[PDB]
């Protein structure tokens, strides 16, 4: 009778079409074995709950009727997996909420899952951390900088950190940041992990309506699948019926970022909630993700952290050696590709196609912000995340002060908005103090009095 029980759905295979070889027909092929078939469902037979598991399961060799779809061969039914993921380990008991969500869930129902059911406050910033998905490592000089810098931007602003949530990617290094640093105001940080329901180790230990589910974080059963992270506060487990596959999380994460960007950041303030991307290691698929962010509808600025590994060093290596309009000086094109040959070993064709993807990223160089870790003076990633939202978007100078006014952060406004050259018009500074008085932003009233407001 609750809201989650009446609205959200789970998905399961009902129409077994195997991916295997028959001894003669329609059925086994290791031995008889009575188990070892492999549906496009992804599970096997005897896993399809009690019914839809029988003989005459779909020369022929399971072809021409294959046509597998999670749209045309899957059954919707209400969710049986919401509650609490009290983690057994790491003496501070970390409570975390979760739900099993369908991939076809409407993007506004997901928003009233977060803002109404889970009673989360509307964020003032959304940080989407992308990068590696293969348990990479970090230089400890880099890790103590990115840890201190990411968590500062989520406390000073009221921010949501969207990770993959699973402990075999960049969600671990966000989780290590939440451990090694401030746990006093970390109750105010919402770190949402949007993962598939086919990757998680102990899914069957998360089954049940509202409950405190005991859940491991260790003991590593050959690491064939992956496990949830301890230091995420909320999990959105995306189900598309299948088991052991990746991909259902991708559209539901991005359409969440669109609808939060559509929401209004404050009652007085008339702007959308800003969304920023963060790129730790990479992979060949992250270069497509960066290019996707730059070209949709007014774009998501990306923040690339060099030194952190594989593809983020490539986007920094291009950003260094190009023209402001994104033009290599016609003599470095083999010099670029041979670096891609070493990092991403595909060879001579797909590295060329990956170079054409990076050249499309360099047309919009005003939206990409590289962070040079410790060899810099423009340090403190906290600044570099927030200043990426001001430059590149081509907003008004009034609109940059007002965005920093909501964040209650004056160091961004005093050093970057109030710079020489900014042409303030008549009623912009006067209306900004009217917002600064009502919102009880005392340090902005001090800043605008020192800039010409009576």
Numbering used by the authors: 4 to 61, 69 to 464
Question: Can you provide the manuscript's text about this entry?
Answer:
The transient receptor potential channel TRPM7 is a master regulator of the organismal balance of divalent cations that plays an essential role in embryonic development, immune responses, cell mobility, proliferation, and differentiation. The TRPM7 structure represents a tetramer assembled of four identical subunits, with the overall architecture reminiscent of other TRPM channels. Each TRPM7 subunit consists of an intracellular N-terminal domain (NTD, residues 1–789), transmembrane domain (TMD, 839–1146), and cytosolic C-terminal domain (CTD, 1157–1230).
The NTD includes four melastatin homology regions (MHR1-4).
